[PDB]
Amino acid sequence: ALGKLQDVVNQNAQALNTLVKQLSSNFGAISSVLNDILSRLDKVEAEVQ
Amino acid sequence: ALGKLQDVVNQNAQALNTLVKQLSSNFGAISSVLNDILSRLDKVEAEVQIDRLITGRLQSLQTYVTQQLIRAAEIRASANLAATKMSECVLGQSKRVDFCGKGYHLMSFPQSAPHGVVFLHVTYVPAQEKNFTTAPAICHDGKAHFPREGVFVSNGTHWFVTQRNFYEPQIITTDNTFVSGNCDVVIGIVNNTVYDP
Amino acid sequence: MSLGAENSVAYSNNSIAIPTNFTISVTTEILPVSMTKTSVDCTMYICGDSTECSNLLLQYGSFCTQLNRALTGIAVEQDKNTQEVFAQVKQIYKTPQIKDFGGFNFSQILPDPSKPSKRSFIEDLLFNKVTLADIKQYGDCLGDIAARDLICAQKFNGLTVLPPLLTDEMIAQYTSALLAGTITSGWTFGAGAALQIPFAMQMAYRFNGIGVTQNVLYENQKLIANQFNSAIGKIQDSLSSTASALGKLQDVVNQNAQALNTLVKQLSSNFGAISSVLNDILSRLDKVEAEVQIDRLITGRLQSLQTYVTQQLIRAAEIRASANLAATKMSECVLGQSKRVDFCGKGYHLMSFPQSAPHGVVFLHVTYVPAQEKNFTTAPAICHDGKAHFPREGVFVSNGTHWFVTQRNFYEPQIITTDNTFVSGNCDVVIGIVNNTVYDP
Amino acid sequence: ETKCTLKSFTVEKGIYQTSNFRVQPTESIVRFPNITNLCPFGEVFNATTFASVYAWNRKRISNCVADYSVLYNSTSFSTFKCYGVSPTKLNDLCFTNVYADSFVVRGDEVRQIAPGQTGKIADYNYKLPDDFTGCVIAWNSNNLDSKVGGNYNYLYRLFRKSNLKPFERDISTEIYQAGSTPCNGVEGFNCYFPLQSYGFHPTNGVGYQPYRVVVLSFELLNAPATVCGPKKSTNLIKNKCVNFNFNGLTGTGVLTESNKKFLPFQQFGRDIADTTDAVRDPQTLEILDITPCSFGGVSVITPGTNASNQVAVLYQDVNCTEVPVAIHANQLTPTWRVYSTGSNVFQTRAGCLIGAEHVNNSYECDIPIGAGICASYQTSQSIIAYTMSLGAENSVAYSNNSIAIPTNFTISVTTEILPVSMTKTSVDCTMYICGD
């Protein structure tokens, strides 16, 4: 019993977890880390990334 | 009739068709065909074109999913209303006004339909009304008499007591009325006689 | 925070509390019905008077049709909400000429013919209590201004507001017809042809519905009419003084205006381009290495339009749910009497009266509240001749010496006769039976 | 037009909203300022001597016309690049503050005059900003800056403590301490003079030959222009859908006389949505305002195309007397012009309806126009507009001693249709996006 409250809690936790883990996507860039882009490229031709 | 089921079907078909036909968009790329991009360009300076196409198609899919969820919420609300009506009007009799048809509800019958349900409501409608002269109470022996159920009516000469939803006049006896107080505070009381068995 | 006032009730196994008086209480309920209908010209919002931007936007063709289809569906749903909320009956019942209603005074809710718009006093107060920030005719924006009003900005950026199908006079006529039907015919006009009845007999029907014998009305008619008139006047002076009410209609209007203003002011974003102005890009760069900037601007503005449309759909669903609730309350409380608890006000429901409001409806619920209770000693049954007696309706009470039978909601003691009780079994199984005598006529 | 908005050849009965498809601009005007002096390209491209790269020369250029077609006969440029502006748009623009930086560098170091470069010249002599706008010009000058025996009058800095800032100049000649021991202001071991001289012989390689470099820096600031392009002004056209060019700013719309005060050293005045509306005419000093040429708020009311082809047009929030000015009916086709005026003209609270006659009757709403007005197709055949009827007028005979009692009844059945479920769909994203 109490499946409805349980899966509401599970849905909220899963949404937060996938929002956290969606930070590892390149989105068509050279890397998913801002530090690598800021460390390997200058002020120009890094704004696109 | 049956416009709701028809346009739900039409909405779903139109959404699928426009999702199919949205594949012919460049999204700012040189072409809308992946084969031309992969045939005219090398591995580098072709990832940007494929990235534009991927972003556009992902946006289209997300828009379709969002509209599907929004439609599903309304469909679920309609299904909840249909389940409530089936429970409260097929499995019983409802006193709620206009919940299951115009007039006073008597019965209901369910029928199936493509992605839907059809309720046949059987109700009672009064007709052929007649004018009458009424009174709140009757003072017979210095005391007021109020009807148990129904009202006092008069055809010009005599007085009768009748039920409210149908005309069925009866002699005003002590088994139809009850006594409460004297005939001094009720506004519009009428002198008459009350039969005693 | 404090939950409320601490209270306790004196409970024993042989005690009752019976009310001896009553009050007639009227309450107000405000429900939104519809909202503003908007239309968006996508090719004018994204590419204002630019042919190259139009040619580039020709690739994104079906998105504009999809957005316009969604907005038109929202608009026709907004009209339909008012259609099933207010157009319940299809007969425009004229107001009666004579106003002999047994002492009841419906002057503040009936229409006033002196005003150009046939509206009541309460309806005028309700319209004056909502700002309804708009009427800007085209041409006034043309010249003598730099569009500080932001309506000219919305019009020049391709955002328009469509007027509703039913004007305020027709809604006022519908409410007047419902009010004339419900005070001259009772609930009969909502289930067929309207049958006339005096108002006192109608209120006797309502009192019999809530469980009180109808002689209470015929003995306290003047007091009930005075209480009803005083409470109507109290609602009138409460609404004529403070503006803290009608918050729902006000913040629906505020939400729509804020959404439109945000959509207008989102045009000043670069979206990762060299500038947010199409003219600078078209005047500083040639045909190539300018399609990328216009493509970025097109993608950003299309995203903004899609976000606005999605939020509008989400708001429209909630507005439709509220309109469905309002239609249900209209059909179940104005056209009849409801036995559901707290569906149409605190207490026992007697009547309801509708009034119009900007994108909404206001219900005045007339209810019955008992008051001035008293303690009594109570028995479940009476054993007279070796057999138990149970009341047909009401309960047995005792004032210390003698026993009486009374109705449950009002104090009206009577002699325990054989016409008030019925006999079932011997006085051996009922727990707490009390010896007494049952009179026989 | 409403066939074109729906992208179909058949139209169902009802009301539709259409996009703008009527008015097209035809005329174009230019409003450049009147400057007559030719710009002194020669005084900077034909000087008898230039400056060293470590002491590059900066000159301000103002109140001139940049034609640059007079340089086609004299000099040919080996390097010509531009950042922030396309080269073909240079004749249509007016600048604000033009700065020319001139020097002479080796032919192998011309590639270092660019943003983001590194090396010897870009680190210690001359550095460009990352957000640089303007152009770089460089050409060979072996027959001018080189002579027999060696030209040693050009110098460059070889050593420095740190890299230069953008547009920074350093002419100090202090002794550079390469090692750890102090130099004490005298040359020696690990103590070098920071400047060194180019050896420009007329017989060395192409990469070791003198090149002359001129860097032009500009900006499109909101200020009166001083340097313009070679364009001729055009007379003002008002109250028409025209293209305009004001001091290099291009646009489209309708020009109308207006008024506003404006601060002198500013030029452009924007709107809430960053749209330019306030300008100063450089030839007449009259501030006009720009209005969009497109108009929105046109709806088409029609029956089905299977029925007929007649339509009615509703203009939203437009007075029925001001309709042809608001839609520019003078420059439209006559088939659109017949819907601008005529006899069937009705003024409603929703606007102006043209093409349907206004009857005095009242029926049920067939096609909802708005504000209590509906329209329908009735009888020849025509399109009529009316005010919708709420219902049948009725009255009830009320008195204080009268009641009405029913004497008969009817049993009535009725339908109620309710949707329950819909179509269940699934997608395959890796097949939809990237098929095989």
Ligand SMILES: *[C@@H]1O[C@H](CO)[C@@H](O[C@@H]2O[C@H](CO)[C@@H](O)[C@H](O)[C@H]2NC(C)=O)[C@H](O)[C@H]1NC(C)=O
């Ligand atoms: C009102 O109703 C009463 C009862 O039905 C009528 O009285 C009867 O009238 C009939 C004639 O139609 C006589 O034959 C009966 O003998 C009457 N009964 C009694 C007890 O007197 C009366 O006529 C009706 N009045 C009107 C005006 O219709």
Ligand SMILES: *[C@@H]1O[C@H](CO)[C@@H](O[C@@H]2O[C@H](CO)[C@@H](O)[C@H](O)[C@H]2NC(C)=O)[C@H](O)[C@H]1NC(C)=O
């Ligand atoms: C109803 O009947 C009562 C008699 O029971 C009437 O009361 C009498 O009326 C006469 C004439 O006005 C007086 O002289 C008597 O003194 C009254 N007696 C009492 C006890 O009140 C009464 O008037 C009748 N009402 C109507 C409307 O006819």
Ligand SMILES: *[C@@H]1O[C@H](CO)[C@@H](O[C@@H]2O[C@H](CO)[C@@H](O)[C@H](O)[C@H]2NC(C)=O)[C@H](O)[C@H]1NC(C)=O
């Ligand atoms: C029931 O309550 C009403 C309302 O409070 C009482 O009516 C009041 O009676 C007093 C004294 O008779 C008057 O001064 C007030 O003006 C009355 N109020 C109104 C609104 O008319 C009534 O007396 C109460 N009844 C009982 C039995 O207690």
Ligand SMILES: *[C@@H]1O[C@H](CO)[C@@H](O[C@@H]2O[C@H](CO)[C@@H](O)[C@H](O)[C@H]2NC(C)=O)[C@H](O)[C@H]1NC(C)=O
């Ligand atoms: C109904 O209540 C009102 C409020 O006290 C009574 O007073 C009238 O109020 C209206 C305001 O809408 C005025 O225009 C009238 O002039 C007022 N009349 C008087 C006599 O002051 C009104 O009289 C009551 N209705 C009845 C039938 O008594």
Ligand SMILES: *[C@@H]1O[C@H](CO)[C@@H](O[C@@H]2O[C@H](CO)[C@@H](O)[C@H](O)[C@H]2NC(C)=O)[C@H](O)[C@H]1NC(C)=O
């Ligand atoms: C309980 O109620 C009964 C009935 O009202 C009371 O009996 C009457 O009391 C009065 C005095 O207040 C006498 O004048 C009557 O003659 C009594 N009637 C009978 C039939 O005896 C009784 O007094 C009440 N008891 C209490 C404790 O208040």
Ligand SMILES: *[C@@H]1O[C@H](CO)[C@@H](O[C@@H]2O[C@H](CO)[C@@H](O)[C@H](O)[C@H]2NC(C)=O)[C@H](O)[C@H]1NC(C)=O
């Ligand atoms: C209620 O009255 C009955 C009389 O009908 C009482 O019953 C009698 O009580 C006496 C005294 O205890 C006994 O001697 C008799 O045998 C009983 N008769 C019967 C038929 O039961 C009864 O006790 C009374 N109850 C109360 C609570 O007073």
Ligand SMILES: *[C@@H]1O[C@H](CO)[C@@H](O[C@@H]2O[C@H](CO)[C@@H](O)[C@H](O)[C@H]2NC(C)=O)[C@H](O)[C@H]1NC(C)=O
């Ligand atoms: C601008 O001048 C300052 C002051 O001399 C320079 O900062 C010095 O740089 C040297 C070389 O690294 C250091 O040894 C000093 O300690 C610095 N002094 C201070 C106060 O910071 C600075 O390098 C010069 N700017 C450039 C671009 O060369």
Ligand SMILES: *[C@@H]1O[C@H](CO)[C@@H](O[C@@H]2O[C@H](CO)[C@@H](O)[C@H](O)[C@H]2NC(C)=O)[C@H](O)[C@H]1NC(C)=O
């Ligand atoms: C109540 O209404 C029904 C329905 O109209 C009436 O029944 C009709 O009576 C007439 C005359 O006797 C017949 O010709 C019809 O065929 C009947 N219709 C049906 C469906 O049976 C009935 O007579 C009415 N009753 C009263 C008292 O007026």
Ligand SMILES: CCCCC/C=C/C/C=C/CCCCCCCC(=O)O
């Ligand atoms: C005295 C300089 C005045 C500068 C004023 C503003 C500059 C705008 C025009 C720049 C053009 C410079 C000449 C470039 C010629 C290129 C032709 C070629 O490829 O051969």
Ligand SMILES: CCCCC/C=C/C/C=C/CCCCCCCC(=O)O
């Ligand atoms: C033997 C190579 C070891 C170094 C490998 C690590 C890479 C870092 C150095 C790369 C630059 C090499 C010299 C280029 C000098 C600048 C060019 C110029 O004159 O403008």
Ligand SMILES: *[C@@H]1O[C@H](CO)[C@@H](O)[C@H](O)[C@H]1NC(C)=O
């Ligand atoms: C009742 O009487 C009134 C007034 O004479 C009349 O208008 C009405 O039609 C009558 N009702 C019936 C059902 O005859």
Ligand SMILES: *[C@@H]1O[C@H](CO)[C@@H](O)[C@H](O)[C@H]1NC(C)=O
């Ligand atoms: C009904 O109204 C009439 C006229 O106003 C009046 O003469 C009569 O006394 C009233 N009757 C009642 C019971 O109120």
Ligand SMILES: *[C@@H]1O[C@H](CO)[C@@H](O)[C@H](O)[C@H]1NC(C)=O
């Ligand atoms: C009933 O009696 C209890 C206990 O004496 C008391 O607390 C309560 O107030 C009484 N009720 C009334 C209405 O006085």
Ligand SMILES: *[C@@H]1O[C@H](CO)[C@@H](O)[C@H](O)[C@H]1NC(C)=O
């Ligand atoms: C009520 O409770 C009291 C308290 O114990 C008890 O003495 C009495 O018998 C009870 N009466 C009934 C009818 O239960």
Ligand SMILES: *[C@@H]1O[C@H](CO)[C@@H](O)[C@H](O)[C@H]1NC(C)=O
């Ligand atoms: C450039 O300078 C030389 C030398 O003074 C001169 O002969 C020539 O005419 C000049 N050319 C131009 C275009 O000024």
Ligand SMILES: *[C@@H]1O[C@H](CO)[C@@H](O)[C@H](O)[C@H]1NC(C)=O
């Ligand atoms: C300039 O043009 C003239 C003829 O137009 C030509 O004789 C002359 O040689 C040109 N100048 C140079 C430096 O070639």
